[model samples]
Target: SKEDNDMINKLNKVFKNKLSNTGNIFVKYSNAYKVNAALMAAISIHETGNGSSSLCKNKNNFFGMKGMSFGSVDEGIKRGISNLSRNYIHTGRKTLESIRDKYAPLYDSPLNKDWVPGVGKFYKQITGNAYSSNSAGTGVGSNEEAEKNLK
Candidate 1:
């Protein structure tokens, strides 16, 4: 949609100064790993505060992926995509909510925040599916409904 395209344009304007040609780089790594490219970018954006975090600027960490450090942007991207392919996607944590619970726990850190809406926004952008809302009116909708249906 045009609205989504405009949103991405505005996001890129901010991200351009923070990251250098990140869309291509993210796609490269995502393609190599068979990960969803937008999801990959979205998670990085959510974690890095749109690439403003020290982890990106100083550590070259694209996804703020947990580890001691990284030496370069490519290295960090590789590490991030590797984790996503091997652990997050392959381990059957297919939904954004499950990924967030393990990847960025809201209760675990002072700065750890809810990651779904941002990621879900990008998920919608890439997949053309509207982000479903939770009972509390957030974007973890289908998973919550799945749980309810289970019970």
Candidate 2:
């Protein structure tokens, strides 16, 4: 679809290093899981340092997910979006600010403070929109319907 291609181009323009041109995978999973494509890509870019991190390269864990590994980058992208959709987005942590505390957790370290704004910066660059706290809505439908379906 042209929309997907447009998103891919926008994503690839901001993505660098090993993450380049990988937006298709993100867009695919995002549509399937009904999550925001840019949000998922923003988290991956922030977590994997634009996909150059050792974990992403070696384990195919693009989201810096702890104790998890994937057989391929495609699988990593799939699982990353699925995990965020089921655990975070569908659970009502729809915004980067809302997800930050649980996803990064303040108790983990002081550096967790940067997670939201960092991902938000990438999200804005990718989507050409400001980082709003309620922006990560279910892409295909209403959040309430999405949640009801999940339940």
Give stretches of model 1 more than 4 Å off: 1-14, 110-113, 125-151
Across residues 1-151, which tens digit of lDDT does each residue of candidate 1 receive? 3644543454354354466455556655555555565677667777877778887888888787766478877778667866776667656666777787888888888555668777877556544665442211111223333234335
> Residue 49's C-alpha lDDT in candidate 1?
74
Q: Per-residue CA lDDT of candidate 2, range 1-151, in tens?
A: 7998998889888888778889898887787778788889999999999989999888999998998999988989888887788778877787676788789997698878889889988988888897775666554334354445446
How many clashing pairs per prediction, in order? 0, 0
Clashing pairs in 2: none
How far does residue 63 in candidate 2 sit from its true spot (Å)? 0.3
Model 2: weakest 10-residue lDDT segment is: 138-147
- Give all candidate RMSDs, comma-separated: 9.9, 4.1
